[PDB]
């Protein structure tokens, strides 16, 4: 046992030394001589109403026009943001929903939360009603995030310190991802749907291969829980938001933290994070009732989305980069552009 | 607009009407978060998430038991029912630390805790037996005496009353260490047979609402 611990410590020291030498320079001093974004002023082009409690999750559809919103009132609402219409009103079995997702095809939506079950709802079907299709059970802790890979594959993260891949038709766990010490709070699928990163309360981020099931990399740069994670549009990096009241941009091909976004007046934790189409603007949503537009390259607050009376819970972008959506505890979803 | 868009807008209006109806129906309920630990009767107070619904005086209460993130979920809840076991003294300090953590919880600064001390009968029996002494686990107990004018009992033992009041004083002065008056700790005693628990929770929720109203009016 003592020998095993000594070897573990030696390997950790070797990892730290190897990843310390590779850091020849820093992204901060590499991106100093560029054009700063300036002022990112965005206006609420649409404000969605109908949710009568805190909004916890929201996910855009593939067409950048249909979006699902899950709120503490216990209802999944599909919004047509172009005409602010309510395409569907999906009543959830459990009101303690903390995540929701939109199937890439658009035929299905996913919702999960404190019940440890990821419910799938069939949208496009005869009889003209959205109906429950499959209920994914097997996670031990609360569900933090869920994302579809296709019409039959969905990846979830739970509070039991694990992430899983599912076959919806069989409704069975195809792979279990292990190694996180704390609760896993966020997961982002890669653009190629081959890898995905996850951050947890252990103040670390881990990259997982969807097929093999092994942890290819593990990252540690936080001194508090990581609450949100988002993959870069390139797929070769990601960003994490923590209770530290700071964001951090990590890479995959260098295996160490690259950037940190923080402000002295910013002492509230980061609730949500997302990336624009270009990945130039890491948009974060905090507990101070506003969102910040952090230039991911320069780590500066180039903009603010201040129209929410309560904490910003969810923050996503359209697939075409034309609009952003923010849901807060004020029970209002807002499309900004 | 096109006829198709007009029909879509009509459908959206019907959906809005349904949402308003559901919210109107669901607005009246009062929520409660049940916290505690094992061997504490946490789930044995009233007769994913084991939500329970119960009514008193035409007021509906929704108690939620989960199984410390996710505490953010219960941020606008009426009260937190924090059950503790005061029969076994070794983990009494663990329960005190848990109460401290929950009481100083950033998300729960304005949430009044209805603190419950369970299985007081076992504590009284242990006091009578004398096998275990709280002084062995809390030396200050040896230097503690029950208040003269604040001991309303039904004819119980002074030793039992003194021990119970010592534990209650520890919990209460943890509560008031730094509260600022924005929330209060309501201590109570339960023996797993006392069915007058819903009444206590109702009275404490009424007191919490009253205190919030007075604070809004600055009367207190």
């Amino acid at each position: 046992l003592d020998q095993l611990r000594q070897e573990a410590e030696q390997l950790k020291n070797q990892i730290r030394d190897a990843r310390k030498a590779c850091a020849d320079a820093t992204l901060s001093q590499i991106t100093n001589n560029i054009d700063p974004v300036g002022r990112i002023q965005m206006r609420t082009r649409r404000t969605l109403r109908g949710h009568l409690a805190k909004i916890y999750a929201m996910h855009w559809g593939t067409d950048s026009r249909l979006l699902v919103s899950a709120s503490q009132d216990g209802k999944l609402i599909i919004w047509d943001s172009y005409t602010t219409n309510k395409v569907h009103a999906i009543p959830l079995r459990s009101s303690w929903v903390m995540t929701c997702a939109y199937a890439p095809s658009g035929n299905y939506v996913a919702c999960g939360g404190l019940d440890n079950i990821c419910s799938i709802y069939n949208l496009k079907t005869r009889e003209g009603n959205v109906r429950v299709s499959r209920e994914l059970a097997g996670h031990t802790g609360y569900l933090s995030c869920c994302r579809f890979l296709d019409d039959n594959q969905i990846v979830t993260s739970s509070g039991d310190t694990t992430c899983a891949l599912w076959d919806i038709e069989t409704g069975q766990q195809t792979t279990t991802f292990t190694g996180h010490t704390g609760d896993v709070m966020s997961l982002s699928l890669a653009p190629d749907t081959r890898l995905f990163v996850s951050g947890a309360c252990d103040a670390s981020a881990k990259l997982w291969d969807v097929r093999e099931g092994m942890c290819r990399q593990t990252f540690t740069g936080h001194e508090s829980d990581i609450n949100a994670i988002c993959f870069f549009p390139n797929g070769n990096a990601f960003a994490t938001g923590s209770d530290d009241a700071t964001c951090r941009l990590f890479d995959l091909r260098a295996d160490q933290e690259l950037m940190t976004y923080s402000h002295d007046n910013i002492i509230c934790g980061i609730t949500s994070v997302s990336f624009s189409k270009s990945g130039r603007l890491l948009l974060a949503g905090y507990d101070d009732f506003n969102c910040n537009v952090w230039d991911a390259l320069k780590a500066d607050r180039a903009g603010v989305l201040a129209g929410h009376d309560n904490r910003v819970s969810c923050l996503g972008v359209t697939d075409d980069g034309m609009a952003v959506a923010t849901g807060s505890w004020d029970s209002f979803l807002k499309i900004w552009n | 607009v096109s006829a198709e868009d007009k029909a879509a807008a009509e459908r959206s209006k019907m959906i809005d009407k349904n949402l308003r109806e559901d919210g109107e129906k669901a607005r009246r309920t009062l929520r409660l978060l049940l916290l505690g630990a094992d061997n504490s009767g946490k789930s044995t107070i009233v007769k994913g998430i084991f939500e329970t619904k119960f009514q008193v005086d035409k007021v509906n209460f929704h108690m939620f038991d989960v199984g410390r993130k996710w505490i953010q979920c219960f941020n606008d809840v009426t009260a937190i029912i924090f059950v503790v076991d005061s029969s076994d003294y070794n983990r009494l300090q663990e329960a005190l630390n848990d109460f401290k953590s929950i009481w100083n919880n950033r998300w729960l600064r304005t949430i009044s805790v209805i603190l419950f001390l369970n299985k007081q009968d076992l504590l009284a029996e242990k006091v009578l037996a004398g096998k275990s002494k709280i002084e062995d686990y809390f030396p200050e107990f040896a230097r503690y005496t029950t208040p003269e004018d604040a001991t309303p009992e039904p004819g119980e033992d002074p030793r039992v009353t003194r021990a119970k009041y010592f534990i209650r004083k520890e919990f209460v002065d943890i509560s008031t260490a730094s509260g600022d008056g924005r929330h209060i700790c309501y201590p109570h005693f339960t023996c797993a047979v006392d069915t007058e628990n819903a009444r206590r929770i109702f009275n404490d929720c009424k007191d919490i609402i009253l205190q919030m109203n007075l604070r809004e009016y600055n009367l207190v």
Partner: single-chain antibody
Amino acid sequence: VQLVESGGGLVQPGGSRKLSCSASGFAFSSFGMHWVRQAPEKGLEWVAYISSGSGTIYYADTVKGRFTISRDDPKNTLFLQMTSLRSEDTAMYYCVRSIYYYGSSPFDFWGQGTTLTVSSDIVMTQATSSVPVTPGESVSISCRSSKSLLHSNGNTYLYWFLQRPGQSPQLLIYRMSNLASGVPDRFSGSGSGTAFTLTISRLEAEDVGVYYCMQHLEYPLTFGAGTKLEL
């Protein structure tokens, strides 16, 4: 999904009758309903329409004032009350379901009709009344409208239906570009402003009947003359 229709029968001119459409197999309450008749040998003619929640109703000027359209959602039924019947009201009547929201397919399901015998508007026409075809060939059927069916929202409101002998019309392409459910991929549609075409590649048996093109931009809903394909 079934829409069974009752009524019909012999009627003396100047009388009244009630047509019914009982629906079973879908969320009737969330579906709008339409009535479409077909003369003994002529094409199709829109009659009436009732919206979800009974909040919007439309009729046809040809029968406006004498017809009434209602619906019993809890009973899952659609009703058409007739009054002051005329000699031009002898036809076969059909009930159609159509739900309206983004990405939806109105006029998805038609039904078997009932025979009744008694003893301005946007215009689109079908130039060809008969077009012989051979199995395995490709057939293009085009039908043009009076004005542009393209709207500010980007939708071209043209719908295609096939009526095989002794059968009810069935939808093939909706909004001039989107396929339906249960229809083989061989059918397709396309076009631009006022120029609308429907292509069938690898024509096969069971694809013989009358093709009708309809518009939905604004009421009344007008049908084409009907292009008949024969072996």
